[PDB]
Coordinates of C-alpha atoms and ligand atoms in Angstrom, one line a residue:
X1 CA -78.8 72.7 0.3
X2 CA -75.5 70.1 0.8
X3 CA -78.3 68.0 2.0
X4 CA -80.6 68.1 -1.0
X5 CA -76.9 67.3 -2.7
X6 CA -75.7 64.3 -0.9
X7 CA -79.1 62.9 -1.1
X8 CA -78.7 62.7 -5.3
X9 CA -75.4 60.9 -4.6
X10 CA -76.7 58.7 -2.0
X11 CA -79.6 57.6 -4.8
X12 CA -76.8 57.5 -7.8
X13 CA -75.0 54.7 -5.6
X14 CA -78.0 52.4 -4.8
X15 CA -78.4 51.7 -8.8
X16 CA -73.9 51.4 -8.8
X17 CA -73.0 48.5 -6.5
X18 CA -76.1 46.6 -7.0
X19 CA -76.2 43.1 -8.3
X20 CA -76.3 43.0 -12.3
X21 CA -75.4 40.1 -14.2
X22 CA -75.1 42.7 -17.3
X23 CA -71.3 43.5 -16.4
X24 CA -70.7 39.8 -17.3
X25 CA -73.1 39.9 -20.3
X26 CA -70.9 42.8 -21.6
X27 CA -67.8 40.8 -20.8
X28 CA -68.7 37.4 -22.5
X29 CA -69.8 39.6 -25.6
X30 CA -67.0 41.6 -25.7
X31 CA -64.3 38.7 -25.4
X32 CA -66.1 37.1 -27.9
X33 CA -65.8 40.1 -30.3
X34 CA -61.8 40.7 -29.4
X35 CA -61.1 36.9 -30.3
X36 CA -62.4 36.8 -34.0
X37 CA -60.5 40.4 -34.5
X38 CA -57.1 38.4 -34.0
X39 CA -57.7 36.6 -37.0
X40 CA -57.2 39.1 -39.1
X41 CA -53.9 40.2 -40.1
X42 CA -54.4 43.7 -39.6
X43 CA -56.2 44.1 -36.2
X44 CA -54.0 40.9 -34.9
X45 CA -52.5 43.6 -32.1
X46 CA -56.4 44.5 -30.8
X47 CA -57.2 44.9 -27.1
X48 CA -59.1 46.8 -24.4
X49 CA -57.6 49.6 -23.3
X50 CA -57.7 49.0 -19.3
X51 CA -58.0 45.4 -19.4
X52 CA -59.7 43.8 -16.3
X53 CA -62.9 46.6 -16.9
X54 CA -65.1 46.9 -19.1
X55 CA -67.5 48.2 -17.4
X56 CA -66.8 51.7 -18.1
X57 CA -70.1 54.4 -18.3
X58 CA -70.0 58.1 -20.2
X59 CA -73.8 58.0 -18.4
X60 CA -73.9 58.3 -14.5
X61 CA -77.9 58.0 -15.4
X62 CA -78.1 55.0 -17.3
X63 CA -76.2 52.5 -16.3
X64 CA -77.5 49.5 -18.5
X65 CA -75.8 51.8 -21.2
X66 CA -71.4 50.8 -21.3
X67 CA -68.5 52.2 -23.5
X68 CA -65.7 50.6 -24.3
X69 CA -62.1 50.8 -26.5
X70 CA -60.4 48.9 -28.9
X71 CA -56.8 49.3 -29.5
X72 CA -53.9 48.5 -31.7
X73 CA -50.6 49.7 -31.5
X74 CA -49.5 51.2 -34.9
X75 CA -45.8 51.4 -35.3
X76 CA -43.2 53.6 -38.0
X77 CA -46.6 56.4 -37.7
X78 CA -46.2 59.5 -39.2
X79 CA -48.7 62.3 -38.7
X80 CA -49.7 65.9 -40.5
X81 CA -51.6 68.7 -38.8
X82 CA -54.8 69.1 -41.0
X83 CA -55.9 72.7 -41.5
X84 CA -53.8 74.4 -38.4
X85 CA -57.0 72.5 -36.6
X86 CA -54.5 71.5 -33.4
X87 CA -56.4 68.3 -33.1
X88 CA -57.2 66.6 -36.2
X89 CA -54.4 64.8 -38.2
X90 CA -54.2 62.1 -41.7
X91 CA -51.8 59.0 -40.5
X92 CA -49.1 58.3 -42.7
X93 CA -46.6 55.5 -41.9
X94 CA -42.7 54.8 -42.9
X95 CA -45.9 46.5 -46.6
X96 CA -47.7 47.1 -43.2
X97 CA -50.6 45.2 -41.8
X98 CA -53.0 48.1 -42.7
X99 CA -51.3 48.3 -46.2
X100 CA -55.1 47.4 -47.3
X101 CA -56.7 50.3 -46.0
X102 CA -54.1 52.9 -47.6
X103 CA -55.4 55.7 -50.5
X104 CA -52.7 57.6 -51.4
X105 CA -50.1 58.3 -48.4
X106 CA -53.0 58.7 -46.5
X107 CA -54.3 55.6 -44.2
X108 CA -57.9 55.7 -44.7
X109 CA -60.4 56.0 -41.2
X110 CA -63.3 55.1 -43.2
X111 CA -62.1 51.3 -45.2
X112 CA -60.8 50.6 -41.2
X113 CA -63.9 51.0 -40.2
X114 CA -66.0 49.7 -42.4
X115 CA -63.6 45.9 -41.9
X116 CA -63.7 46.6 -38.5
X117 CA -67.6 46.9 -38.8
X118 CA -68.2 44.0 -40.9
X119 CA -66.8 41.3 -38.9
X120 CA -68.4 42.9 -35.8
X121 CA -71.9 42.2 -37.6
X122 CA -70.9 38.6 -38.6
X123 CA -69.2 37.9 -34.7
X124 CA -73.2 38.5 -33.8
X125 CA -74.7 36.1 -35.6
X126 CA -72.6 33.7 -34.5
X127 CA -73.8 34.3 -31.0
X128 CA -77.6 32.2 -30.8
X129 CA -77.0 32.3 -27.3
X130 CA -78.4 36.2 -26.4
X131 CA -79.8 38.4 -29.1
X132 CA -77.4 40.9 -30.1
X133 CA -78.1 43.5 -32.5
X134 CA -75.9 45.8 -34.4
X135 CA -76.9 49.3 -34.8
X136 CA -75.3 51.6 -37.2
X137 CA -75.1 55.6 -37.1
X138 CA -72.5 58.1 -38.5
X139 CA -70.1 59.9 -36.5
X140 CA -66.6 58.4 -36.7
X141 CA -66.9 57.2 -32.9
X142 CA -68.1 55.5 -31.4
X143 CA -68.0 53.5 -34.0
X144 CA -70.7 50.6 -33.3
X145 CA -72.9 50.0 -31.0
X146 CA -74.7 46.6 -30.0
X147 CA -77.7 45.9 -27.9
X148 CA -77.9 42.8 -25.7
X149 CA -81.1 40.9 -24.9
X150 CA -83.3 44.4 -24.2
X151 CA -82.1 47.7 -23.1
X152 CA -78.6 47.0 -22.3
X153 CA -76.1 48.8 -24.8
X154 CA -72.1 48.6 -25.5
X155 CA -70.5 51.7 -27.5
X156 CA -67.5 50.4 -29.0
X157 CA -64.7 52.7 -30.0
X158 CA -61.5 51.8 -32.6
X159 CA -58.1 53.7 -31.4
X160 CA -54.9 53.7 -32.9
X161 CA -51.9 53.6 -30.4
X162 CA -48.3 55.4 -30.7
X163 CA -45.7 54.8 -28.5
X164 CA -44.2 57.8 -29.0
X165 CA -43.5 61.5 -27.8
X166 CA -47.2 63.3 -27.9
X167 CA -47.8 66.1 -30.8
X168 CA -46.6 69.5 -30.6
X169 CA -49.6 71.0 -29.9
X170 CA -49.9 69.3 -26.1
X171 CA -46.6 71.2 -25.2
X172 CA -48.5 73.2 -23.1
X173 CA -51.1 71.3 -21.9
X174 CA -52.4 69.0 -18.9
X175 CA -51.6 72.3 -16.8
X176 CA -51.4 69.4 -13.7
X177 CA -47.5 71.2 -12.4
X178 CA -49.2 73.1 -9.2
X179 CA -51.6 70.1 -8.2
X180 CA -50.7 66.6 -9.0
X181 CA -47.1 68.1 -9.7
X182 CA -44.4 68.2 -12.3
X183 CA -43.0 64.7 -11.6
X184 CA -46.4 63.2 -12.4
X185 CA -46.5 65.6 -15.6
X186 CA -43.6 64.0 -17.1
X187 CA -44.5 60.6 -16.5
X188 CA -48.3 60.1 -18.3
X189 CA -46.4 62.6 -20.7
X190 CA -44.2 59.6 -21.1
X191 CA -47.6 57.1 -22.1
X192 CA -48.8 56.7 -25.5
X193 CA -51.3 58.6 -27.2
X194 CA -54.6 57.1 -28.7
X195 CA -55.8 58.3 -31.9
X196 CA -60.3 57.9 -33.1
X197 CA -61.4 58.1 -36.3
X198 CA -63.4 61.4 -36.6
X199 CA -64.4 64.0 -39.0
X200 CA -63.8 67.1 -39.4
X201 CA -66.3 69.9 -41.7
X202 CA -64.9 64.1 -46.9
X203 CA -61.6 64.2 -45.2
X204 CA -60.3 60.6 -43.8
X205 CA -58.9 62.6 -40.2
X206 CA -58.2 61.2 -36.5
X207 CA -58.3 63.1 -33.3
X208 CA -56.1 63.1 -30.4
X209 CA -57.4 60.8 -27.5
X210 CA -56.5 61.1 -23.6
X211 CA -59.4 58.8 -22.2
X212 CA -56.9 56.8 -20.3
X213 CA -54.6 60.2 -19.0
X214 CA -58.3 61.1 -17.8
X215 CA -59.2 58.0 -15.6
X216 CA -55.5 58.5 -14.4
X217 CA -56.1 61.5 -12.8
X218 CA -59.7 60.7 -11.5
X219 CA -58.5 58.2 -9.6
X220 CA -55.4 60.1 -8.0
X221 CA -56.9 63.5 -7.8
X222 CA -55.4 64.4 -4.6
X223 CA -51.8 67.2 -3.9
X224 CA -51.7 64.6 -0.8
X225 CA -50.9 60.9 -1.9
X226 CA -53.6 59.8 0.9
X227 CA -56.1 62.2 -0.2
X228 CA -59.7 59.8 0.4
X229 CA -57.6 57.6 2.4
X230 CA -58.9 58.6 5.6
X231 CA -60.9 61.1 7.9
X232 CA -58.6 63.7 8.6
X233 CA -58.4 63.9 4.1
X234 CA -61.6 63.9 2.7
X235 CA -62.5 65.8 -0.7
X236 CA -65.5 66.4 -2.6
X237 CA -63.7 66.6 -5.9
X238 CA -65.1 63.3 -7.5
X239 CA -68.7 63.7 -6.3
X240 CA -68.5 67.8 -7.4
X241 CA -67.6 65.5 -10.8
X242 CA -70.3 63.1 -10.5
X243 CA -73.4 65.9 -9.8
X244 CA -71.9 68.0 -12.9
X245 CA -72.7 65.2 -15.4
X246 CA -75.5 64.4 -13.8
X247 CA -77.0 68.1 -14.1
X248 CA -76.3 68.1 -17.5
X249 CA -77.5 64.7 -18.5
X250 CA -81.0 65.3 -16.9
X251 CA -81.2 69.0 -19.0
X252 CA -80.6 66.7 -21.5
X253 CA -83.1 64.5 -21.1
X254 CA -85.6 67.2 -20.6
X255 CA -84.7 68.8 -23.5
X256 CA -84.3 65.8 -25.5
X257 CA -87.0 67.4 -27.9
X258 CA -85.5 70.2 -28.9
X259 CA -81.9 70.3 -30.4
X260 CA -80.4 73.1 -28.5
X261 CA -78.0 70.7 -26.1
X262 CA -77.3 67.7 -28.3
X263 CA -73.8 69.5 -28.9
X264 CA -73.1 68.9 -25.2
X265 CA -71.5 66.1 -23.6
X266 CA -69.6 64.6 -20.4
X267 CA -66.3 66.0 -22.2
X268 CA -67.3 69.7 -22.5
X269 CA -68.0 69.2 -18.1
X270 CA -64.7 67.1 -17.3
X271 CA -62.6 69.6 -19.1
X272 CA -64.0 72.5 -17.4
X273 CA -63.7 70.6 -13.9
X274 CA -59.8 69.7 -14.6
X275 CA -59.6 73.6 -15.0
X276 CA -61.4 74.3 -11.7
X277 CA -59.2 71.4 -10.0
X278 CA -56.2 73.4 -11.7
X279 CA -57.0 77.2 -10.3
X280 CA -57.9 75.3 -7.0
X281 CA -54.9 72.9 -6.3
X282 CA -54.7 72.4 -2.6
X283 CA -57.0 69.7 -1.0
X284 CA -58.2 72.3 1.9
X285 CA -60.0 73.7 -1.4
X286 CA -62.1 70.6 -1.6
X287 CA -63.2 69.8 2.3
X288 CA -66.7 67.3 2.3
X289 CA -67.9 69.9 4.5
X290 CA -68.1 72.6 1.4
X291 CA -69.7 70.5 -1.1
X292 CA -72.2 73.0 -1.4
X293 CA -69.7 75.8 -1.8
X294 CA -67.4 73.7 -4.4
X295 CA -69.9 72.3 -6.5
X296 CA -71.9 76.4 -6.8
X297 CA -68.4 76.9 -7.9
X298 CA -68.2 74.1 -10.5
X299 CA -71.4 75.4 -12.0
X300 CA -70.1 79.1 -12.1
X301 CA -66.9 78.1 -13.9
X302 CA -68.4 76.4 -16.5
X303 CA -71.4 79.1 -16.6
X304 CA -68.8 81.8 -17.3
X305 CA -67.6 79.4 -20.1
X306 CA -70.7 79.4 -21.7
X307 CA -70.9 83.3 -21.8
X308 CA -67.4 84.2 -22.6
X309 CA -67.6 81.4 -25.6
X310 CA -64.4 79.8 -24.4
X311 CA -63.6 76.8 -22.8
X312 CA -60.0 75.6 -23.6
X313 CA -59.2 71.8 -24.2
X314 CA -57.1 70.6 -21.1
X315 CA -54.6 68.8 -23.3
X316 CA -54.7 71.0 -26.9
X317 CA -54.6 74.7 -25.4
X318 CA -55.2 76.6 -28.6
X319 CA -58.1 74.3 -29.0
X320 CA -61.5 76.0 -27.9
X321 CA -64.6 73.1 -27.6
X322 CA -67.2 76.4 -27.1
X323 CA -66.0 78.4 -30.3
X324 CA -68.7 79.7 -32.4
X325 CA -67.6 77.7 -34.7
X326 CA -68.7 74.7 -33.6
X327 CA -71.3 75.3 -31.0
X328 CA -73.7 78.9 -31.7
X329 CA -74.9 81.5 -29.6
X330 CA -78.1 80.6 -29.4
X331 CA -77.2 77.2 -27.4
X332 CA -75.0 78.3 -24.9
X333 CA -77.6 81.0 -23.9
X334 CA -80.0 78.4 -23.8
X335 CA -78.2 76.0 -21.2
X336 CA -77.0 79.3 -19.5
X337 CA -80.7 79.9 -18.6
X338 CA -81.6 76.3 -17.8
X339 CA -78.7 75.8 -15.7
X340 CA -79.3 79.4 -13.7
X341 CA -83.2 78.5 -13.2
X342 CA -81.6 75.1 -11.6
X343 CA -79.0 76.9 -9.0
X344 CA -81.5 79.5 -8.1
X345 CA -84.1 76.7 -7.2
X346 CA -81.7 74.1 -5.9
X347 CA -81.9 71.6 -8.4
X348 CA -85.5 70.4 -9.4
X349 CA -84.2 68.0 -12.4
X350 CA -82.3 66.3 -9.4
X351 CA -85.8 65.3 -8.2
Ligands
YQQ1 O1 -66.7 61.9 -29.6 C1 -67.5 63.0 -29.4 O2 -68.1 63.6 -30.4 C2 -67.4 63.5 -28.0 C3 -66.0 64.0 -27.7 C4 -65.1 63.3 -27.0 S1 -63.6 64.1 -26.9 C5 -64.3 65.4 -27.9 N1 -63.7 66.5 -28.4 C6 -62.4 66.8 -28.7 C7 -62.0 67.8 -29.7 C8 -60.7 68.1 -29.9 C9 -59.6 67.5 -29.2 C10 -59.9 66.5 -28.2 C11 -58.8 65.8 -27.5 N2 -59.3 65.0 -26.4 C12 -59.7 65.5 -25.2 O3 -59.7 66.7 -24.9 C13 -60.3 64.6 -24.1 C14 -60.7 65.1 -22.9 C15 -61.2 64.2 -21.9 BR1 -61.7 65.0 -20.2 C16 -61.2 62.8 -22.1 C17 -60.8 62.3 -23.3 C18 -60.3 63.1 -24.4 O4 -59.9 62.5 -25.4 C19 -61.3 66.1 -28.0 N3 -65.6 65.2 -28.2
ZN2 ZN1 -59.8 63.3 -2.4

């Protein structure tokens, strides 16, 4: 079956690499947009989060579709715990650039946006070079999203940055102590923390963001510091990843009609993987000859997640993203059965 496998990842490669002069459409767009924003007093301190790419994808199946951050560092920030949530919080500071988007003691998510909006959509017309159009949905964040020339899309996200010790209720998170180590646990522990505007069931609340803790670990997954540096260390953890979001974004699609899996996203997969890479620590656990083995594995985990109702953040432990609360029954049984048809015919959607 491994060769069924590597074939979907030798095909999701051929549409990576290839030349695209989108990645500098996105660039020249984006630039453009992070200029006007430091005329304004308030988002004067604005930036990308990893500067140098932008070229960043939530979709391993579309890849004319990008995703992108904005931040800006907010100093003297104060926060309170909204409704024993764990992960939603009001911002409260200790005259203040943002001192126009204040209502009460509260700093208000929706007046940031809707500035942050407005010279976005004037930026665009300003641009008679390539047709740029601004699309507007709710949701908190992303935040905008524009569409250049035809069919190529940015998703662009506002986040407030603290330089500061992370909230209490990541004490006993990012479970990383018996795989990347305790060393490395303290030090993006030591990072800020990034903050998006998003509602919860109107209150004016942020969530806790760890995007860039995320790509930290992706890109040094290994207990070995040479793990995929040569021969003798090869893993499977990334493409185990890579095949996982691409499962569920082609149910997705299928379904696409029906509502059952629009609650689903990459997030919901990459924190059930981290767990995986958690109860599985040592390299020899991940060997390119077992992708097969590992990835059957991947899908079980996050099967048994769907069943049992829980699937605990990897940073917030308290917080469960399958609670019936927030995703029903009826769902999870749905992409139980979808996903079990899959496995037991090795993949069709792969196609
Ligand atoms: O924006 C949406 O609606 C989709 C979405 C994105 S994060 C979310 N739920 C969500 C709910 C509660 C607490 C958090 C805290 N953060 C994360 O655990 C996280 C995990 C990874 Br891996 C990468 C980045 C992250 O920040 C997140 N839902
Ligand atoms: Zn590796």
């Amino acid at each position: 079956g491994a060769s069924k496998l590597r074939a979907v990842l030798e095909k999701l490669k051929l549409s990576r690499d290839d030349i695209s002069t989108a990645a500098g459409m996105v660039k020249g767009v984006v630039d453009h947009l992070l200029l006007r924003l430091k005329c304004d007093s308030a988002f004067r301190g604005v930036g990308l989060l990893n500067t140098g790419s932008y070229y960043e994808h939530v979709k391993i199946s579309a890849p004319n579709e990008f995703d992108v951050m904005f931040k800006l560092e907010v100093p003297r920030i104060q926060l309170e715990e909204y409704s024993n949530t764990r992960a939603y919080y009001f911002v409260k500071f200790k005259e203040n650039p943002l001192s126009q988007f204040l209502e009460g003691e509260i700093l208000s998510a929706s007046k940031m946006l809707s500035k942050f909006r407005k010279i976005i959509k004037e930026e665009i017309n300003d641009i008679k070079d390539t047709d740029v159009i601004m699309k507007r949905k709710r949701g908190g964040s992303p935040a905008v999203t524009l569409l250049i020339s035809e069919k190529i899309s940015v998703d662009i996200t506002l986040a407030l940055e603290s330089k500061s010790s992370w909230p209490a209720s990541t004490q006993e998170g990012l479970r990383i102590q018996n795989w990347l180590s305790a060393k490395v646990r303290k030090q993006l522990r030591l990072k800020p923390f990034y903050l998006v505007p998003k509602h919860a069931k109107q209150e004016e609340t942020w969530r806790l963001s760890f995007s860039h803790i995320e790509k930290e670990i992706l890109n040094n997954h290994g207990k070995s510091k040479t793990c995929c540096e040569n021969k003798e260390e090869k893993c499977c953890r990334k493409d185990c990843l890579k095949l996982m979001k691409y499962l569920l974004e082609q149910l997705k699609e299928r379904f696409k009609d029906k509502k059952h899996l629009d609650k689903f996203s990459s997030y919901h997969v990459k924190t059930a993987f981290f767990h995986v890479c958690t109860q599985n620590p040592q390299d020899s656990q991940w060997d390119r000859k077992d992708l097969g083995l590992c990835f059957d594995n991947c899908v079980t985990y996050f099967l048994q997640c769907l069943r049992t109702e829980k699937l605990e953040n990897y940073f917030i432990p308290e917080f469960n993203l399958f609670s019936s609360n927030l995703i029903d029954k009826r769902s999870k049984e749905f992409l139980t059965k979808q996903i079990e048809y899959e496995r037991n015919n090795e993949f069709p959607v792969f196609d």
